[PDB]
Design a protein around this ligand. Structure first.
Ligand SMILES: [K+]
Ligand SMILES: [Mg+2]
Ligand SMILES: [Mg+2]
Ligand SMILES: [Mg+2]
Ligand SMILES: [Mg+2]
Ligand SMILES: [Mg+2]
Ligand SMILES: [Mg+2]
Ligand SMILES: [Mg+2]
Ligand SMILES: [Mg+2]
Ligand SMILES: [Mg+2]
Ligand SMILES: [Mg+2]
Ligand SMILES: [Mg+2]
Ligand SMILES: [Mg+2]
Ligand SMILES: [Mg+2]
Ligand SMILES: [Mg+2]
Ligand SMILES: [Mg+2]
Ligand SMILES: [Mg+2]
Ligand SMILES: [Mg+2]
Ligand SMILES: [Mg+2]
Ligand SMILES: [Mg+2]
Ligand SMILES: [Mg+2]
Ligand SMILES: [Mg+2]
Ligand SMILES: [Mg+2]
Ligand SMILES: [Mg+2]
Ligand SMILES: [Mg+2]
Ligand SMILES: [Mg+2]
Ligand SMILES: [Mg+2]
Ligand SMILES: [Mg+2]
Ligand SMILES: [Mg+2]
Ligand SMILES: [Mg+2]
Ligand SMILES: [Mg+2]
Ligand SMILES: [Mg+2]
Ligand SMILES: [Mg+2]
Ligand SMILES: [Mg+2]
Ligand SMILES: [Mg+2]
Ligand SMILES: [Mg+2]
Ligand SMILES: [Mg+2]
Ligand SMILES: [Mg+2]
Ligand SMILES: [Mg+2]
Ligand SMILES: [Mg+2]
Ligand SMILES: [Mg+2]
Ligand SMILES: [Mg+2]
Ligand SMILES: [Mg+2]
Ligand SMILES: [Mg+2]
Ligand SMILES: [Mg+2]
Ligand SMILES: [Mg+2]
Ligand SMILES: [Mg+2]
Ligand SMILES: [Mg+2]
Ligand SMILES: [Mg+2]
Ligand SMILES: [Mg+2]
Ligand SMILES: [Mg+2]
Ligand SMILES: [Mg+2]
Ligand SMILES: [Mg+2]
Ligand SMILES: [Mg+2]
Ligand SMILES: [Mg+2]
Ligand SMILES: [Mg+2]
Ligand SMILES: [Mg+2]
Ligand SMILES: [Mg+2]
Ligand SMILES: [Mg+2]
Ligand SMILES: [Mg+2]
Ligand SMILES: [Mg+2]
Ligand SMILES: [Mg+2]
Ligand SMILES: [Mg+2]
Ligand SMILES: [Mg+2]
Ligand SMILES: [Mg+2]
Ligand SMILES: [Mg+2]
Ligand SMILES: [Mg+2]
Ligand SMILES: [Mg+2]
Ligand SMILES: [Mg+2]
Ligand SMILES: [Mg+2]
Ligand SMILES: [Mg+2]
Ligand SMILES: [Mg+2]
Ligand SMILES: [Mg+2]
Ligand SMILES: [Mg+2]
Ligand SMILES: [Mg+2]
Ligand SMILES: [Mg+2]
Ligand SMILES: [Mg+2]
Ligand SMILES: [Mg+2]
Ligand SMILES: [Mg+2]
Ligand SMILES: [Mg+2]
Ligand SMILES: [Mg+2]
Ligand SMILES: [Mg+2]
Ligand SMILES: [Mg+2]
Ligand SMILES: [Mg+2]
Ligand SMILES: [Mg+2]
Ligand SMILES: [Mg+2]
Ligand SMILES: [Mg+2]
Ligand SMILES: [Mg+2]
Ligand SMILES: [Mg+2]
Ligand SMILES: [Mg+2]
Ligand SMILES: [Mg+2]
Ligand SMILES: [Mg+2]
Ligand SMILES: [Mg+2]
Ligand SMILES: [Mg+2]
Ligand SMILES: [Mg+2]
Ligand SMILES: [Mg+2]
Ligand SMILES: [Mg+2]
Ligand SMILES: [Mg+2]
Ligand SMILES: [Mg+2]
Ligand SMILES: [Mg+2]
Ligand SMILES: [Mg+2]
Ligand SMILES: [Mg+2]
Ligand SMILES: [Mg+2]
Ligand SMILES: [Mg+2]
Ligand SMILES: [Mg+2]
Ligand SMILES: [Mg+2]
Ligand SMILES: [Mg+2]
Ligand SMILES: [Mg+2]
Ligand SMILES: [Mg+2]
Ligand SMILES: [Mg+2]
Ligand SMILES: [Mg+2]
Ligand SMILES: [Mg+2]
Ligand SMILES: [Mg+2]
Ligand SMILES: [Mg+2]
Ligand SMILES: [Mg+2]
Ligand SMILES: [Mg+2]
Ligand SMILES: [Mg+2]
Ligand SMILES: [Mg+2]
Ligand SMILES: [Mg+2]
Ligand SMILES: [Mg+2]
Ligand SMILES: [Mg+2]
Ligand SMILES: [Mg+2]
Ligand SMILES: [Mg+2]
Ligand SMILES: [Mg+2]
Ligand SMILES: [Mg+2]
Ligand SMILES: [Mg+2]
Ligand SMILES: [Mg+2]
Ligand SMILES: [Mg+2]
Ligand SMILES: [Mg+2]
Ligand SMILES: [Mg+2]
Ligand SMILES: [Mg+2]
Ligand SMILES: [Mg+2]
Ligand SMILES: [Mg+2]
Ligand SMILES: [Mg+2]
Ligand SMILES: [Mg+2]
Ligand SMILES: [Mg+2]
Ligand SMILES: [Mg+2]
Ligand SMILES: [Mg+2]
Ligand SMILES: [Mg+2]
Ligand SMILES: [Mg+2]
Ligand SMILES: [Mg+2]
Ligand SMILES: [Mg+2]
Ligand SMILES: [Mg+2]
Ligand SMILES: [Mg+2]
Ligand SMILES: [Mg+2]
Ligand SMILES: [Mg+2]
Ligand SMILES: [Mg+2]
Ligand SMILES: [Mg+2]
Ligand SMILES: [Mg+2]
Ligand SMILES: [Mg+2]
Ligand SMILES: [Mg+2]
Ligand SMILES: [Mg+2]
Ligand SMILES: [Mg+2]
Ligand SMILES: [Mg+2]
Ligand SMILES: [Mg+2]
Ligand SMILES: [Mg+2]
Ligand SMILES: [Mg+2]
Ligand SMILES: [Mg+2]
Ligand SMILES: [Mg+2]
Ligand SMILES: [Mg+2]
Ligand SMILES: [Mg+2]
Ligand SMILES: [Mg+2]
Ligand SMILES: [Mg+2]
Ligand SMILES: [Mg+2]
Ligand SMILES: [Mg+2]
Ligand SMILES: [Mg+2]
Ligand SMILES: [Mg+2]
Ligand SMILES: [Mg+2]
Ligand SMILES: [Mg+2]
Ligand SMILES: [Mg+2]
Ligand SMILES: [Mg+2]
Ligand SMILES: [Mg+2]
Ligand SMILES: [Mg+2]
Ligand SMILES: [Mg+2]
Ligand SMILES: [Mg+2]
Ligand SMILES: [Mg+2]
Ligand SMILES: [Mg+2]
Ligand SMILES: [Mg+2]
Ligand SMILES: [Mg+2]
Ligand SMILES: [Mg+2]
Ligand SMILES: [Mg+2]
Ligand SMILES: [Mg+2]
Ligand SMILES: [Mg+2]
Ligand SMILES: [Mg+2]
Ligand SMILES: [Mg+2]
Ligand SMILES: [Mg+2]
Ligand SMILES: [Mg+2]
Ligand SMILES: [Mg+2]
Ligand SMILES: [Mg+2]
Ligand SMILES: [Mg+2]
Ligand SMILES: [Mg+2]
Ligand SMILES: [Mg+2]
Ligand SMILES: [Mg+2]
Ligand SMILES: [Mg+2]
Ligand SMILES: [Mg+2]
Ligand SMILES: [Mg+2]
Ligand SMILES: [Mg+2]
Ligand SMILES: [Mg+2]
Ligand SMILES: [Mg+2]
Ligand SMILES: [Mg+2]
Ligand SMILES: [Mg+2]
Ligand SMILES: [Mg+2]
Ligand SMILES: [Mg+2]
Ligand SMILES: [Mg+2]
Ligand SMILES: [Mg+2]
Ligand SMILES: [Mg+2]
Ligand SMILES: [Mg+2]
Ligand SMILES: [Mg+2]
Ligand SMILES: [Mg+2]
Ligand SMILES: [Mg+2]
Ligand SMILES: [Mg+2]
Ligand SMILES: [Mg+2]
Ligand SMILES: [Mg+2]
Ligand SMILES: [Mg+2]
Ligand SMILES: [Mg+2]
Ligand SMILES: [Mg+2]
Ligand SMILES: [Mg+2]
Ligand SMILES: [Mg+2]
Ligand SMILES: [Mg+2]
Ligand SMILES: [Mg+2]
Ligand SMILES: [Mg+2]
Ligand SMILES: [Mg+2]
Ligand SMILES: [Mg+2]
Ligand SMILES: [Mg+2]
Ligand SMILES: [Mg+2]
Ligand SMILES: [Mg+2]
Ligand SMILES: [Mg+2]
Ligand SMILES: [Mg+2]
Ligand SMILES: [Mg+2]
Ligand SMILES: [Mg+2]
Ligand SMILES: [Mg+2]
Ligand SMILES: [Mg+2]
Ligand SMILES: [Mg+2]
Ligand SMILES: [Mg+2]
Ligand SMILES: [Mg+2]
Ligand SMILES: [Mg+2]
Ligand SMILES: [Mg+2]
Ligand SMILES: [Mg+2]
Ligand SMILES: [Mg+2]
Ligand SMILES: [Mg+2]
Ligand SMILES: [Mg+2]
Ligand SMILES: [Mg+2]
Ligand SMILES: [Mg+2]
Ligand SMILES: [Mg+2]
Ligand SMILES: [Mg+2]
Ligand SMILES: [Mg+2]
Ligand SMILES: [Mg+2]
Ligand SMILES: [Mg+2]
Ligand SMILES: [Mg+2]
Ligand SMILES: [Mg+2]
Ligand SMILES: [Mg+2]
Ligand SMILES: [Mg+2]
Ligand SMILES: [Mg+2]
Ligand SMILES: [Mg+2]
Lengths: 122, 249
RNA sequence: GGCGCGUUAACAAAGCGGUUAUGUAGCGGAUUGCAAAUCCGUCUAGUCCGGUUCGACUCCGGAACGCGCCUCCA
RNA sequence: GUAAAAUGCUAAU
RNA sequence: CCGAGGGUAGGGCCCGUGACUGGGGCGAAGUCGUAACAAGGUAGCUGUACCGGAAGGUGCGGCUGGAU
RNA sequence: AGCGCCGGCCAACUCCGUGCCAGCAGCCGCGGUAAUACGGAGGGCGCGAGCGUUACCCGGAUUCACUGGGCGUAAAGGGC
RNA sequence: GCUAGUUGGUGGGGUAAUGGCCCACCAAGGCGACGACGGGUAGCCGGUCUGAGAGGAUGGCCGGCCACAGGGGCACUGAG
RNA sequence: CGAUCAACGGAUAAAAGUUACCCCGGGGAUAACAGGCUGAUCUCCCCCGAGCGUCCACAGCGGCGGGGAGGUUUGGCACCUCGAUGUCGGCUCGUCGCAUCCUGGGGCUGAAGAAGGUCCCAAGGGUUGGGCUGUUCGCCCAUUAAAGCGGCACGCGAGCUG
RNA sequence: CCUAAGGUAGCGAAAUUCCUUGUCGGGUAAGUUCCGACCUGCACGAAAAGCGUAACGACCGGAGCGCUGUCUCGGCGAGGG
RNA sequence: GCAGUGAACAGGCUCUGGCGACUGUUUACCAAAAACACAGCUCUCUGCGAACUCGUAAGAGGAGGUAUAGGGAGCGACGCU
RNA sequence: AAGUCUGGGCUAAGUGGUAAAGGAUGUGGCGCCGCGAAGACAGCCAGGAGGUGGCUUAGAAGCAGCCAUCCUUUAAAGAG
RNA sequence: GAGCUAGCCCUGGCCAGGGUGAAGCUGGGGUGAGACCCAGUGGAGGCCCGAACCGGUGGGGGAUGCAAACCCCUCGGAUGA
């Protein structure tokens, strides 16, 4: 459950460390973003000389949420942080590595390169 | 262009008091050549030196074809002679610059109200129930440029709308005057440059009675005639090398 | 918008119902190696329109532009 | 000890 | 226990960069004056102080690298 | 068989072209209508499968001086 | 101006082996204008270049020594 | 005879201001809010067809003029209310109009397609979250099918805020 | 030309600037506010003092971190009514 | 043991502007402030039966003080002016 | 409350029962021309041409803008 | 009418506890003597935290009130004007 003002960790190597969701790119007025949804975000904290810098308005897909995700089989999954992978307008990740587990919901939503790059899919 | 009247801006170059004197030689040369063309001259701005020269002279040449003829004079003209200001008898090399501008339109500026949006709203500050309930404040927006003027100076929307449009027009005009002035500036610097001894367009060597126009190679020896107005040989020779430049592919 | 003031020559600026204002400049001369300073001379006028008057820069009315002040209780 | 009217001058062996 | 390192917080030094700002060097011409070099037309220079468009001026004290 | 060079330093010069232009330049300086200093040419000088240039080190620099310097007025005696 | 394992002691641990190398404790000492501490830079020498020498510059190949093996830490094995 | 007693039937021989520290008596005889009437201003729609649009008045436009509608704005008037009709914006809750922002249906196009332009029908539903400012308004950020415009005492303070 | 004489230093879109949300720079995804500048100061200015200033302030601005039912956006529970 | 000031009482912090130096004071009961006061600075009056204040006066205060003092005024630590 | 009273006519819009410029083969009634068996008007069927363009324009050459709009078999055919 | 409130006059009373640690003094160092440095002692202050006590900052409640100014939370002063 991500919304504008929500801070997200960056689970890639773009240089970005903290991004702040400013929009949920899901229709006219979606209240919340979950795993596999795209957001617009401000890059609030970055390491020096990365691809993106502080101030950049970027897109990302949310890979992990602290609000548990429910699944048709009756199970659920919950992460310790809210994390996102920064992407381009073609949904491809802009970094070359993905740090940490990602939700299997990303697969079924066409984020296969990200799923591939992720060290564990849960 | 070619057929409209022309403004000629003669400015002293490197040379100091002798550049200013030579500027007056260039000045009298053009006024005469205007007579021998049926052209009318009129001085708009003159800055005389107490020695007889001009640090700057600006005059118009009125008559059909002025910018057609005088246009070939815009540049730096070099003089080489023994100045009246020299006392050891040396030859000094001074410069004067000539700037040729087609005469301008004083075109009047008015607002196309169809490209102006007027917003009315409540003003701010004091007024009691008045300021609370009255659409006295006015914003006028020049839709093409986007610049806006606001007025709540009075209690009246009508007075405030008028003052807003006044200021808006006055600001657009100052923008339009500034563009044409930046355009004029670059044009001028293109013709005149720094006015250094290089950059020269034509030499006037009094020791040798030589007048060389290094743009085409035309040399004469009637330096007295040239300075008395008889410039027509150079122009035509420039004019013909012009058309020989317009031989294409 | 209201009220008051103003528009004079190259500029700045006055008086005046009949009349080279003035200062500086500009213009001719002098002086100076030359320029300045200085000296001898000299000179261009009343925003437009309409009235009064024998006669208007001058007076009255309007316009145009400029300046100054005010436009408050909502 | 007293003794000055008065400014300037570019840039080419 | 120590421990690569990661993290949190506060310091230090250095580099690059910054609206704007300070003066500086330079320039075959500009505007203003003429301070200095000749009792340079008020001898100059001086530390300091106050002042002035600008060089500078003036006060106090010093120096001669001052004139006849 | 080529490359550098021929104002002075520094060895090697005349002619045309150019006319403060085009250009040369390590320094001093050349070029503004008779340029050994620009460009070419002829002639010449120097090296040679090299010739020049750029960068950098020591030298020339007794110009950090120990060998081997200075401080009245050239930079330099500390106010005592 | 620097210094808390800091400088010394005692007792230990460890090592092939001395040592604060490590540890517990006792003492309050240790270093510095003969430049400690910090900052910059650098692998060092035989040698090499230059220089009249004294000096200066330099450490490429070759030899000697040290240091490092993607960036770090660590020990196992072992004569090492 | 002495009056610019010129406020010219002339209050004293003799006289200015300020009050948001204010007070009383009155007035909806008279302003400010809102309503009303009106509609110059405002908004919208037409008529004319000069001209633009390579060509071609009318795809899209419309010189000089002309005719209307509406009753959001700014005014005019002073008709209920001054023994009180609480006034901006926000919040909440809406409801209506349609001159329609979107979605649905259309004609024309200078409509190849896609995407637009323009006009017609259509009010069922919908019409986002932020930065600035008290703001309304407007600009900006990120989105959207779209980020409509107006009426309701510029809706709504015996509902809140201030 | 006029004046009694024409605002010096310092400061300045300010508790002051109408135009104004001036312009530039900073901060923000986006800043009519804020900070730093600029200076045609509508309408600063030197004891109704000018410009600074450590410390202090239930004063008034601006920003960040922390944390939160303020909010998205509301739910449940308690007791007095 | 989830948790040891295990309950109760007991600062959120930082950066940066404006104003006022500061602790104080105020519109009892809508304003606590940038307002008032404040040490301190300056101008001025006052030679003592002082000036000034209250009072018709007497008499008082000033002050059982005496110009390093007393009154009045503005400014408001301090710094540079 | 009193005529679904009488006679002639108009309107088809619920106009009546809310408005203008202006627009219209709405409807009825007048005029005043005109063309018609010299066979009209509408439809249909031919012809509707040629020298073929004249200025500007590589074609604008009957069918852009400019210039005037000659004439043949003819029953009539505009260089439109 | 100063039994409210404002100022002053006389005479009494009150201010838990904790924190900071000025001057001075002592000792040591330092010097020609000094200044001054250091440690200890000391206990200053319109100093700090915080009850009583004196206030009344922000918010909520109350609004025919418990109350014609109250209640709750929060907050300022608390050896001093
Ligand atoms: K009043
Ligand atoms: Mg980066
Ligand atoms: Mg940042
Ligand atoms: Mg940043
Ligand atoms: Mg990425
Ligand atoms: Mg991670
Ligand atoms: Mg001379
Ligand atoms: Mg409009
Ligand atoms: Mg208003
Ligand atoms: Mg405001
Ligand atoms: Mg008012
Ligand atoms: Mg109104
Ligand atoms: Mg006016
Ligand atoms: Mg006059
Ligand atoms: Mg004049
Ligand atoms: Mg006069
Ligand atoms: Mg007079
Ligand atoms: Mg005269
Ligand atoms: Mg004269
Ligand atoms: Mg003369
Ligand atoms: Mg006249
Ligand atoms: Mg007359
Ligand atoms: Mg007249
Ligand atoms: Mg006359
Ligand atoms: Mg006149
Ligand atoms: Mg007149
Ligand atoms: Mg006003
Ligand atoms: Mg008033
Ligand atoms: Mg003298
Ligand atoms: Mg003399
Ligand atoms: Mg003089
Ligand atoms: Mg001069
Ligand atoms: Mg000079
Ligand atoms: Mg560690
Ligand atoms: Mg560490
Ligand atoms: Mg820096
Ligand atoms: Mg001099
Ligand atoms: Mg002098
Ligand atoms: Mg002289
Ligand atoms: Mg002199
Ligand atoms: Mg002198
Ligand atoms: Mg002096
Ligand atoms: Mg003086
Ligand atoms: Mg000297
Ligand atoms: Mg050579
Ligand atoms: Mg030789
Ligand atoms: Mg010959
Ligand atoms: Mg050469
Ligand atoms: Mg050389
Ligand atoms: Mg030459
Ligand atoms: Mg020649
Ligand atoms: Mg020569
Ligand atoms: Mg030659
Ligand atoms: Mg040369
Ligand atoms: Mg040479
Ligand atoms: Mg040569
Ligand atoms: Mg060989
Ligand atoms: Mg050397
Ligand atoms: Mg040496
Ligand atoms: Mg020696
Ligand atoms: Mg020497
Ligand atoms: Mg000495
Ligand atoms: Mg000395
Ligand atoms: Mg000294
Ligand atoms: Mg130990
Ligand atoms: Mg050790
Ligand atoms: Mg010990
Ligand atoms: Mg190091
Ligand atoms: Mg290093
Ligand atoms: Mg040597
Ligand atoms: Mg070495
Ligand atoms: Mg290593
Ligand atoms: Mg490697
Ligand atoms: Mg490794
Ligand atoms: Mg390693
Ligand atoms: Mg009167
Ligand atoms: Mg009267
Ligand atoms: Mg009267
Ligand atoms: Mg009468
Ligand atoms: Mg009377
Ligand atoms: Mg009398
Ligand atoms: Mg009176
Ligand atoms: Mg009164
Ligand atoms: Mg008041
Ligand atoms: Mg007031
Ligand atoms: Mg009162
Ligand atoms: Mg009263
Ligand atoms: Mg009263
Ligand atoms: Mg009253
Ligand atoms: Mg009353
Ligand atoms: Mg009454
Ligand atoms: Mg009346
Ligand atoms: Mg009435
Ligand atoms: Mg009224
Ligand atoms: Mg009115
Ligand atoms: Mg009203
Ligand atoms: Mg009213
Ligand atoms: Mg009104
Ligand atoms: Mg109302
Ligand atoms: Mg009204
Ligand atoms: Mg009403
Ligand atoms: Mg109307
Ligand atoms: Mg109407
Ligand atoms: Mg109207
Ligand atoms: Mg219409
Ligand atoms: Mg056309
Ligand atoms: Mg068409
Ligand atoms: Mg029109
Ligand atoms: Mg009309
Ligand atoms: Mg109408
Ligand atoms: Mg209405
Ligand atoms: Mg109506
Ligand atoms: Mg209305
Ligand atoms: Mg109205
Ligand atoms: Mg009425
Ligand atoms: Mg009436
Ligand atoms: Mg009323
Ligand atoms: Mg009643
Ligand atoms: Mg009533
Ligand atoms: Mg009532
Ligand atoms: Mg509505
Ligand atoms: Mg419709
Ligand atoms: Mg549209
Ligand atoms: Mg549609
Ligand atoms: Mg559609
Ligand atoms: Mg289509
Ligand atoms: Mg298309
Ligand atoms: Mg369509
Ligand atoms: Mg249509
Ligand atoms: Mg609808
Ligand atoms: Mg914010
Ligand atoms: Mg907002
Ligand atoms: Mg807003
Ligand atoms: Mg606004
Ligand atoms: Mg759409
Ligand atoms: Mg759209
Ligand atoms: Mg919005
Ligand atoms: Mg309302
Ligand atoms: Mg509304
Ligand atoms: Mg309301
Ligand atoms: Mg209320
Ligand atoms: Mg309200
Ligand atoms: Mg109500
Ligand atoms: Mg009510
Ligand atoms: Mg109600
Ligand atoms: Mg009511
Ligand atoms: Mg308020
Ligand atoms: Mg309030
Ligand atoms: Mg002023
Ligand atoms: Mg002055
Ligand atoms: Mg001064
Ligand atoms: Mg100043
Ligand atoms: Mg400013
Ligand atoms: Mg601003
Ligand atoms: Mg300020
Ligand atoms: Mg102001
Ligand atoms: Mg402003
Ligand atoms: Mg404003
Ligand atoms: Mg803005
Ligand atoms: Mg910015
Ligand atoms: Mg930041
Ligand atoms: Mg900005
Ligand atoms: Mg705000
Ligand atoms: Mg600022
Ligand atoms: Mg400005
Ligand atoms: Mg002031
Ligand atoms: Mg005053
Ligand atoms: Mg004031
Ligand atoms: Mg004053
Ligand atoms: Mg200040
Ligand atoms: Mg200070
Ligand atoms: Mg301060
Ligand atoms: Mg401070
Ligand atoms: Mg305070
Ligand atoms: Mg206080
Ligand atoms: Mg306070
Ligand atoms: Mg904040
Ligand atoms: Mg924050
Ligand atoms: Mg926060
Ligand atoms: Mg709640
Ligand atoms: Mg409940
Ligand atoms: Mg209950
Ligand atoms: Mg346990
Ligand atoms: Mg506390
Ligand atoms: Mg603050
Ligand atoms: Mg400031
Ligand atoms: Mg401010
Ligand atoms: Mg205070
Ligand atoms: Mg205060
Ligand atoms: Mg202050
Ligand atoms: Mg202060
Ligand atoms: Mg103070
Ligand atoms: Mg102050
Ligand atoms: Mg206190
Ligand atoms: Mg305190
Ligand atoms: Mg009160
Ligand atoms: Mg009160
Ligand atoms: Mg009361
Ligand atoms: Mg209160
Ligand atoms: Mg207050
Ligand atoms: Mg209060
Ligand atoms: Mg307070
Ligand atoms: Mg007060
Ligand atoms: Mg104070
Ligand atoms: Mg003071
Ligand atoms: Mg004093
Ligand atoms: Mg006194
Ligand atoms: Mg009395
Ligand atoms: Mg008395
Ligand atoms: Mg007595
Ligand atoms: Mg006594
Ligand atoms: Mg006193
Ligand atoms: Mg005070
Ligand atoms: Mg004060
Ligand atoms: Mg003050
Ligand atoms: Mg019947
Ligand atoms: Mg009958
Ligand atoms: Mg109908
Ligand atoms: Mg009907
Ligand atoms: Mg009808
Ligand atoms: Mg009492
Ligand atoms: Mg009592
Ligand atoms: Mg007592
Ligand atoms: Mg106490
Ligand atoms: Mg105690
Ligand atoms: Mg205590
Ligand atoms: Mg204590
Ligand atoms: Mg403590
Ligand atoms: Mg102690
Ligand atoms: Mg003692
Ligand atoms: Mg002692
Ligand atoms: Mg002590
Ligand atoms: Mg104590
Ligand atoms: Mg103690
Ligand atoms: Mg205290
Ligand atoms: Mg305290
Ligand atoms: Mg404490
Ligand atoms: Mg009180
Ligand atoms: Mg309270
Ligand atoms: Mg109380
Ligand atoms: Mg609270
Ligand atoms: Mg309350
Ligand atoms: Mg309440
Ligand atoms: Mg009450
Ligand atoms: Mg009651
Ligand atoms: Mg209470
Ligand atoms: Mg209590
Ligand atoms: Mg409490
Ligand atoms: Mg407390
Ligand atoms: Mg307390
Ligand atoms: Mg406290
Ligand atoms: Mg306390
Ligand atoms: Mg206490
Ligand atoms: Mg006491």
């Amino acid at each position: 459950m991500i919304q504008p003002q929500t801070y997200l960790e960056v689970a890639d190597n773009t240089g970005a460390r903290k991004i702040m969701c400013i929009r949920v790119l899901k229709g006219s007025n979606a209240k919340y973003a979950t795993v596999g949804d795209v957001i617009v975000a401000s890059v609030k904290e970055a390491i020096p000389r990365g691809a993106v810098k502080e101030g950049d308005v970027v897109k990302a897909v949310v890979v992990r949420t602290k609000k548990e995700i429910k699944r048709p089989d009756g199970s659920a999954i919950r992460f310790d942080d809210n994390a996102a992978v920064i992407i381009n307008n073609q949904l491809e990740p802009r970094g070359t590595r993905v740090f940490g587990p990602v939700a299997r919901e990303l697969r079924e939503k066409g984020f296969m390169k990200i799923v591939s790059l992720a060290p564990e899919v849960l | 262009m070619d057929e409209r009247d022309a403004i000629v801006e003669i400015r002293a170059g490197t040379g100091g008091e002798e550049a200013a004197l030579f500027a007056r030689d260039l000045f009298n040369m053009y006024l005469r050549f205007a007579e021998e063309m049926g052209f009318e001259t009129e001085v708009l701005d003159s800055h005389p030196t107490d020695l007889g020269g001009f640090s700057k002279v600006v005059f118009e040449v009125r008559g059909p074809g002025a910018y057609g003829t005088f246009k070939y004079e815009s540049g730096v003209h070099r003089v080489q002679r023994v100045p009246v200001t020299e006392t050891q008898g040396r030859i000094h090399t001074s410069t004067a610059t000539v700037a040729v501008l087609p005469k301008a339109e004083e075109e009047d500026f008015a607002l196309n109200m169809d490209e102006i949006r007027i917003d009315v709203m409540r003003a701010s500050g004091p007024g009691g129930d008045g300021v609370n309930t009255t659409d006295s404040a006015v914003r006028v927006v020049h839709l093409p440029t986007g610049i806006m003027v606001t007025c709540q100076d009075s209690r009246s929307q009508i007075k405030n709308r008028e003052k807003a449009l006044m200021i808006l027009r006055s600001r657009l005009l100052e923008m339009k005057r500034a563009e044409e002035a930046e355009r004029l500036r670059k044009t001028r610097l293109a013709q005149i440059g720094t006015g250094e001894r290089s950059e020269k367009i034509r030499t006037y060597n009094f020791p040798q009675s030589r007048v060389t126009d290094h743009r085409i190679g035309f040399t004469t020896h009637d330096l007295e005639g040239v300075l008395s107005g008889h410039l027509t040989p150079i122009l035509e020779a420039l004019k013909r090398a012009d058309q020989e430049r317009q031989l294409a592919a």
